[PDB]
Amino acid sequence: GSGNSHTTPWTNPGLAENFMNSFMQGLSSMPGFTASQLDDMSTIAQSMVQSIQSLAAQGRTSPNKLQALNMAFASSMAQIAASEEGGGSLSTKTSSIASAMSNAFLQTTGVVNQPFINEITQLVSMFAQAG
């Protein structure tokens, strides 16, 4: 083919890595996070990117596994925002996550998946509530 079926972070491991990198790049210019919190998020994002690079190198990714891993990434960001206090309100942190996701979409596909973003923002609230 041409790659017409490998055009999103959910079907293309390289695009998933770029999405995750781009999320972390954008988030660093948004309100609500301390340096130390950004550092933790970048460590976890880099861990997720390497995990995907390694699965890709092995030939072991699939659409379903990539969807699972993109949700894993977004959940880990939601979790850490809910666990780490200081730096801004829950509400500020949440909309910064949403903005960072949104801009990562624009940087990677050129198209924001709003229902995906809305899930992620529901995760922050859920994890904080539980916290």
Place this chain on the structure above:
Amino acid sequence: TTPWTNPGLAENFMNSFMQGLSSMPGFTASQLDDMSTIAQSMVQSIQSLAAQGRTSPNKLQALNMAFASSMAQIAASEEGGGSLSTKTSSIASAMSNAFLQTTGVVNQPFINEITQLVSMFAQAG
């Protein structure tokens, strides 16, 4: 008394979850294959972070939730092999067992979160 404060127990908890799930109803062999690949991948990431001296409780909690949420997402995305209710109950039982085999203390709010994730991921799909 939580499994993911120490990298070693964090890994054991993921492997125990996976080993218990493999004996539970509701999942086909290929679904478990997919879950097993993702679990092995997460354990490896924790090992790599521990070797470079970069773990912390907050980070391990976040990685643990990446794992549990990946399992819930897989379960909700891959149809067949049993009802959503069976998939959710097997996931909850494998999670409960994993706490018992590591710290000895089941974290119920956490189990309840993961159950909610299966349901929220199935609705979104």
